[PDB]
Design a binder for these strands. Structure first.
Ligand SMILES: [Mn+2]
Ligand SMILES: [Mn+2]
Lengths: 929, 295, 75, 295, 295
DNA sequence: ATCTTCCCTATTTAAATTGCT
DNA sequence: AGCAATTTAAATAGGGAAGAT
């Protein structure tokens, strides 16, 4: 590897970086180094070139592509190394940036006018309840609305009038309404409980007129008259001139505001709100010290009076203005040019040369990567990102362990921690034992990286470790919940960090089908927000349903419409890149996405069907599923075994179902040597982690290394009874599976856990589908709702899987890929597709995906909750002693193959099952006994 | 004032994209829309090109023309199949050598002489293939390429009309483009309005070969307005004969290799510089028009 | 022929020498040029780099052999 | 602290001549008498030889040894005829991995295992020949080299002692010296004291392969006092035993090519860096000596 | 400055600081800081050391190595050496490992001499305790310390395996730690990660002990990959095993005195090297390794 | 001695402005 | 619009002195 490093630096920051860059490369003179070094040498040079201080101006070239660029060095657009760069390059009708500046400046000088009431003064001094009857943002909104109703609010002297209690402060003037919504929602968004309003309201002001004081601001309301008697000590020199210059800025630019569309207004006001909380939290974090008394805004850690309200308003204004400037004029730090990506894929990765069919100069890209598992999907996503140049992306993945797997792939192929940042925000205690030096695994949290210039506008220089890893990451391999808060939050400033993260970075969401329906709705909201700033969305899901692919394209198309009309460019359409392991297709799609997507789906189906059938599923006829499991285990051991040893996966639905199947199979008298494992999610930290590592090392069938992790000498049935934790994110390879039916994507995923690593075709049948789910004996009205898309609004007419599924069927992604809306009441696949198009629709609703008008409100974050689960309290095992109503028990010790013990950790119990003892056990975790 | 650098040994080669081209403090440079000023070596530049969002000034154009740098503008194509119109500023203030234009005129006006020159220039692409052999892509001396160029030479030998030359031209272009497609295992259709990298690399090489051809013609004073091959499809001037002498020998395998390896456009610019410089393709074209003119 | 010019001069003698040699090679950067040029064109560059005046500071590297060194070159 | 680069993955190697090596602002740099201070990439340096007229401070050795750079001197016993003591300081402050010493000395003490290991390292000569081919010199697959490699293998298979081994070395090296010389049309007698380029380039490559071999030894912890070849003219230890794996495959073809193609000492030195990092010869010798000790 | 260290019997390990070593009038001298030159007699020295602020030249290096004066580079103090070559039987006449080295290897190989040498290294560690009596430290003749000494002597003499010797060695070492903690009125528990004065002072004193044991192992040519107590996978375990002899006899009382009076690190370094120079601790380790390896 | 830190020391580059064509 | 003259100033290089090892 031959690199060349050039320095642009002034100071002796052309000198103390010269020591480190002259420790690793030869000096060719004139502050230019050039030579041969290894990739780990590149990583070491990066780590000790960035850590040496601020102001390092370093460009590295590997062959002729830029390896890395330290700082905001413009470096190369076409040629490299410019001459002098001075000022005044373009200076356009910027319009919408002047609009955002005027809105943020006018609102930020009015965002805390409502702290001047006597209640907030005695709240800061501390002789009343610290919770206000009406929040000060609403009081400042009442001030601004009363001033606007009285005088002309855009060109007049200010003077705060006598204000009363107003239920609504939103009128008709679109720009005033924007300023009012920025003022009122500078801490939290208003929440609308009204069902008719949630049913009908769509527009900007027409929804904003329904935002009343009862949506969170009106806490208790007994001291309203003191909350609206206000002093007017803000009339000073610099506050009045700042208010005048920003109001006239808005006055001069609001003529382009009425030429915007609804989508524009929503996205622009979201940006304005994010910059306003950025400036407000930035000025509230630091201590300024000086004060002019008689009025105060915030308190220090000692509770003393600080940050008087005139200079508080001025500081929040300038900090929000500077926030806006750096978030709207940033050339963000991108990743290194990974040299182990750009070469050809060989063999089964040979489809990854589809990036040589995509244009490298497209400003936008919507990848739908429909490639099957085991083909290197995430490597292909990184290849697609690097085809357009240097990489800046957020790999948002479900589960901690899947982020760990993608991080380990990124580490061992070409990516160091100067470009990658693995973020899992829980600090799990799963450590690697055996040998620390001989590990060559366990990707960790260090991020030598490079701190971006956006950290100076965040509160108190961003944060410590976690938010520095969030914001400053070129490549952010993260759990997805660090990105879905970009679309907005209920309370606080947790929106700004993923918002500013997704503003300048691409978004790569892998296996989006494993998320929930509301989770997929907020993920497509994130896709729309990412496309709002021209970034590229890579979706990587093999079993995509047309509905999902369509609504994600429509979210990207609305976002790219926002980005196109935001830079005053005519919208040519979205560069959609359909991708699988058999080919690629790049089309400029502005309309008719459905026929092209279904034609690619049909081409992928015909490229999947002439291949040999790997998963032949038979739906059993035996009604009782206990003895159906027995007979199917006996049949698939007598048919599918490797010299007497067979691996079976009993995929069931819920935990007590799993322990019921386990306790039946343990007490089942047979000549077969059944060896039973329980693989559900309710387990203690230690025990769970141990199951994972063992299962990953015994079900690895790409080699014969497993022969030494199990007793393959004696003919044995190694059976793993598992819940849907096996069908998501597990690289497992079973000889056969017996599936309790809950949804068709569960069938396709548990087919993907059988012969995942081998290529031998089954002869007779490798999957035995149960006749009924076990909830049929508990609830015959609805049985597929647990881990399925059946529900109270979408009920199957019959629950028989002979009626709702094929008796003999080759299970692949084809049934999920096709998409059928008719006959959803008597087939599982059409039931699935129905729900997917009836929840992820092209409407705005309130819990929908095109959400417009409601982004202003708190409604999409309350009624569409990301990871909406049950109450979930956590019973914690502390050194062998349980906390709550747990009561350790003893398992049946009949056929347990492996049982790992646990002493620490915690189990997640729903509040429903907290009533009784969860009865934790070493073999199977939680049950009802 | 010295020898002013002869055109065939001029080496630098650019197509400038999204930058206003100006002069700072003596030298011609281009300033992009981020503040970056990159200097142009105008004394050694063969041609510059101007893509979308480009803007050159007067004294910059003067310093290119008086030094002898042919300047064109890449956009202008508006049809569905053809690279329609490329606008090209000739440095005519340098008074050109004359008798090569007289020889080109005496072969252009005589119809049987134009046909004879049409013949030799059609086999000139055949010998271009034989001389300029790349290390990658196809091998020229395989059975399929030799069979098709043998059929091409046999058909162009017995040709007697320019429409027969246009038909045989079409079969030659279809034969090569598709054989390269086969080698690189892709499906190929030549559309100038396509997002596929094998196509816009071919249009970038069209612009590169256009610039090379006007520098070769201007170095001998030959105008583009004397097309020895003409037709309804083939209406671009003499640049659409001295530019596509070197498609299937230089540009099209280089475009397919660049679209197969798949980095950005700048490696293709630099690869065109490297192959036009190492094998001296400009001097090769000039010397071929030299042995054309005096025969 | 691929050559490389390195300049180690002082302003405004650096300004004028950068002006003159930037007409012949690509600006690889930091007062260092690299590019393709014929050897008799290299002699042309030498001839008008001598006539450009004193205090001038140019070294050359064809491959790595010093093709011409102008002034009391440090190297 | 970091991984601090694996010593097989260091690519820079130097032999400095007529300079004062020192530390100036934490930089390993050699200063000549003309006032020129050239830095050295000490965290990427494999070795720094020091020729006549050289000098080095303490701190330069301190931060070369902390970065794992082997420093030797080309005088003393560096006349290369006796090859007794080329003064070669190693960084033993770093506590090296031990297991290669253990397997190496288990086979050393056992004389039959030493004889077998010597045969493996003698076969590594022809292995090096086959792996590292050169396109500017002797083809390895011609009849003379294949015949002499076959004769060398059939002689070293039936070998009984180290005196028999010493003789097989005479044959291989001397006749490969000669075979190159007859193909390079030069009457050549190997002489370390000779002035012709065919010998000064050979001694420079001797020092370069000395540095590569000694860095490969020290990497594994292997010293030099445990050689596999014992003889009257084989004074010098294990570093020459590792180094003469890559005379006739690398050092000798590069030296012969250099002399024939009139390279200067500097470019021969560089040609040596290019071959030692393009084929990754340090990792080759390190992995192959792991194959040698192993059990 | 100029510093003399007796090592075996008659040869002296010269340590040179703040001086420039070169050749004046045909023999090796060095200019010192005061501008006064000092020569060196070749007969009385074999080891010559280059401390901080010291540069040597090439012909001085060559003439020093041709006179049997083998040079090493060390951190200032003379007992923190980072660069040297390997002792042979003779520096010019032949290249053989030293008798001490070979004896060590043979003793290490056969399991019985390895066990006997492990017992012996602990016998001489108890001897070291008594031999090097300090003033500020605890009395070695005290009843508790003598009981610990006799417990260690019984445990080493009655043991037949290495892990028993490791448990007994840890018991003795931390029992002396407990005794010195009982002296200096502190709760002392040995951990490397603590930032208190006693633990970090003992850590850097242990690093000084590792340096002087490394010099003593190098000076008889003993390699750093044959530990007696520590495992085969422990990198540089023989340095730790030899430094164990003086860790609890010299480093521990000096470190506890240094943390008791609380002075800084450089003056603890000068106290450690003053104790090394005054009582000839390196010469004690040299004679210790001779008596171990000779048996 | 070697090397580092810092203070002169002024020598040396980059920007800035502005008539002039 | 490019440039030139010409100021203005920020920074780069170097030498001497003193303090560390
Ligand atoms: Mn507030
Ligand atoms: Mn505030």
């Amino acid at each position: 590897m031959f690199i060349r490093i050039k320095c642009f630096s002034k100071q002796p920051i052309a000198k103390k970086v010269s020591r480190e860059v002259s420790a690793y490369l030869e000096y060719t003179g004139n502050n230019t180094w050039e030579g041969h070094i290894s990739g780990q040498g590149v990583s070491n040079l990066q780590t000790k070139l960035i850590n040496v201080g601020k102001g390092v101006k370093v460009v590295c070239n590997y062959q002729d592509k830029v390896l890395f660029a330290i700082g905001n060095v413009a470096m190369s657009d076409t040629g490299s190394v410019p001459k002098y760069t001075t000022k005044k390059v373009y200076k356009p009708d910027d319009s919408i940036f002047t609009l955002k500046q005027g809105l943020v400046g006018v609102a930020a000088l009015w965002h805390d006018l409502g702290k001047a009431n006597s209640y907030f003064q005695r709240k800061l001094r501390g002789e009343c309840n610290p919770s206000d009857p009406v929040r000060h943002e609403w009081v400042s909104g009442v001030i601004v609305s009363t001033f606007a109703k009285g005088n002309d609010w855009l060109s007049d002297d200010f003077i705060i009038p006598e204000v009363k209690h107003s239920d609504n402060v939103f009128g008709d003037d679109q720009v005033l309404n924007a300023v009012l919504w920025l003022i009122n929602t500078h801490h939290k968004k208003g929440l609308v409980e009204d069902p008719i309003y949630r049913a009908t309201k769509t527009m900007f002001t027409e929804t904003l007129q329904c935002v009343n004081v009862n949506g969170g601001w009106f806490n208790y309301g007994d001291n309203i008259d003191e909350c609206y008697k206000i002093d007017t000590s803000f009339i000073t020199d610099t506050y009045v001139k700042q208010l005048n210059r920003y109001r006239k800025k808005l006055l001069a630019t609001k003529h382009i505001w009425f030429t915007l569309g609804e989508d524009q207004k929503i996205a622009i006001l979201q940006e304005c709100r994010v910059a306003l909380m950025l400036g407000d939290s930035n000025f509230s974090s630091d201590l300024i010290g000086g004060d002019g008394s008689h009025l105060y805004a915030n308190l220090d850690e000692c509770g003393n009076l600080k940050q008087t309200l005139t200079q508080h308003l001025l500081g929040v204004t300038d900090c929000a203005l500077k926030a806006l400037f750096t978030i709207n004029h940033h050339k963000p730090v991108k990743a290194n040019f990974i040299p182990t990506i750009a070469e050809k894929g060989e063999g089964k990765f040979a489809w990854q040369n589809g990036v040589n069919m995509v244009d490298s100069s497209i400003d936008n890209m919507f990848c739908i990567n429909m490639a099957s598992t085991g083909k290197g999907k995430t490597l292909a996503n990184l290849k697609l990102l690097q085809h357009f140049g240097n990489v800046r992306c957020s790999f948002g993945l479900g589960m901690v362990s899947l982020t760990k797997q993608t991080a380990k792939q990124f580490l061992d192929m070409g990516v160091d921690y100067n470009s990658a940042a693995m973020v899992t925000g829980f600090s799990k205690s799963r450590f690697n034992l055996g040998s620390e030096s001989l590990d060559q695994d366990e990707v960790s949290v260090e991020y030598w990286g490079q701190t971006s210039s956006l950290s100076k506008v965040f509160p108190n220089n961003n944060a410590g470790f976690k938010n520095k890893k969030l914001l400053s990451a070129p490549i952010l391999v993260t759990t997805t919940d660090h990105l879905v808060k970009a679309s907005g939050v209920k309370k606080g400033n947790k929106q700004m960090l993923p918002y500013v993260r997704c503003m300048h970075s691409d978004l790569v969401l892998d296996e989006i089908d494993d998320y929930g329906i509301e989770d997929m709705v907020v993920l497509a909201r994130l896709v729309y927000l990412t496309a709002c700033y021209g970034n590229k969305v890579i979706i990587s899901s093999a079993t995509i349903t047309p509905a999902i692919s369509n609504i994600f394209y429509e979210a990207y198309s609305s976002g790219y419409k926002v980005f196109c009309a935001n830079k005053q460019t005519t919208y040519k359409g979205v560069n959609v890149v359909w991708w699988d392991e058999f080919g690629i297709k790049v089309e400029k799609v502005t309309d008719q996405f459905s026929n092209l997507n279904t034609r690619f789906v049909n081409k992928r189906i015909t490229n999947l069907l002439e291949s040999t059938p790997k998963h032949k599923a038979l739906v059993v006829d035996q009604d009782d599923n206990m003895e159906a499991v027995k007979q199917s285990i006996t049949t698939l051991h007598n048919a599918h075994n490797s010299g007497g040893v067979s691996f079976g996966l009993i995929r069931t639905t819920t935990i007590k179902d799993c322990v019921a199947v386990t306790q039946e199979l343990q007490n089942w008298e047979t000549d077969l040597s059944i060896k039973i494992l329980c693989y559900h999610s309710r387990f203690v930290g230690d025990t769970k982690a141990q199951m994972e590592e063992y299962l990953s090392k015994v079900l690895n069938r790409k080699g014969d290394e497993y022969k030494k992790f199990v007793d393959t000498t004696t003919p044995t049935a190694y059976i793993v009874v598992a819940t849907p934790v096996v069908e998501v994110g597990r690289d497992f390879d079973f000889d056969w599976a017996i599936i309790e039916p809950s949804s068709e994507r569960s069938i396709v995923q548990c087919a993907g856990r059988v012969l995942r690593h081998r290529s031998s075709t089954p002869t007779t049948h490798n999957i035995h589908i149960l006749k009924y789910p076990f909830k049929f004996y508990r609830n015959s009205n609805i049985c597929y709702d647990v881990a399925g898309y059946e529900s109270k609004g979408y009920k199957l007419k019959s629950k028989n899987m002979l009626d709702i599924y094929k008796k003999e069927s080759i299970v692949n992604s084809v049934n999920r890929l096709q998409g059928d809306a008719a006959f959803y009441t008597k087939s599982l696949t059409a039931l699935e597709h129905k729900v997917l198009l009836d929840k992820l629709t092209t409407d705005i609703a309130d819990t929908n995906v095109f959400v417009g008008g409601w982004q202003l409100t708190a409604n999409p974050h309350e009624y569409c909750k990301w990871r909406r689960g049950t109450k979930n309290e956590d019973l914690v095992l502390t050194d062998g002693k349980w906390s709550g109503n747990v009561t350790t028990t003893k398992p049946i010790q009949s056929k347990i193959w492996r049982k790992w013990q646990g002493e620490n950790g915690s189990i997640t119990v729903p509040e429903y099952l907290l009533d009784k003892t969860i009865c934790y056990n070493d073999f199977y975790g939680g049950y009802e006994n | 004032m010295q020898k002013q650098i002869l055109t065939s040994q001029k080496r630098n080669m650019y197509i400038l994209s999204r930058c206003k081209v100006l002069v700072k403090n003596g030298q011609v440079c281009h300033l992009h829309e981020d503040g970056n000023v990159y200097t142009v070596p105008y004394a050694n530049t063969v041609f510059i090109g101007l893509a979308e969002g480009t803007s050159i000034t007067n004294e910059a154009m003067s310093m290119l023309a008086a030094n002898g740098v042919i300047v064109f503008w890449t956009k202008g194509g508006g049809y569905d199949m053809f690279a329609a119109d490329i606008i090209c500023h000739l440095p005519q203030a340098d008074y050109r050598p004359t008798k090569y234009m007289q020889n080109w005129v005496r072969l252009w006006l005589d119809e049987e002489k134009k046909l004879s020159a049409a013949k030799e220039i059609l086999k000139m692409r055949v010998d271009s293939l034989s001389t300029h052999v790349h290390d990658f892509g196809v091998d020229v001396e395989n059975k399929r390429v030799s069979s098709i160029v043998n059929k091409f030479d046999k058909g162009v030998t017995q040709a007697t009309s320019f429409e027969s030359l246009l038909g045989h031209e079409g079969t030659f272009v279809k034969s090569l483009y598709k054989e390269y497609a086969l080698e690189y295992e892709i499906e190929f259709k030549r559309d100038h309005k396509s997002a596929d990298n094998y196509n816009k690399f071919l249009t970038l090489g069209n612009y590169y070969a256009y610039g090379i051809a006007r520098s070769s013609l201007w170095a001998l004073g030959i105008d583009n307005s004397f097309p020895l091959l003409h037709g309804s499809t083939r209406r671009g001037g003499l640049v659409f004969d001295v530019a596509d002498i070197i498609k299937t020998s230089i540009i099209l395998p280089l475009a397919f290799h660049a679209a197969d390896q798949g980095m950005s456009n700048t490696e293709f610019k630099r690869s065109c510089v490297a192959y036009f410089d190492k094998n001296d393709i400009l001097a090769y074209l000039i010397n071929n028009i030299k042995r054309l003119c005096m025969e």
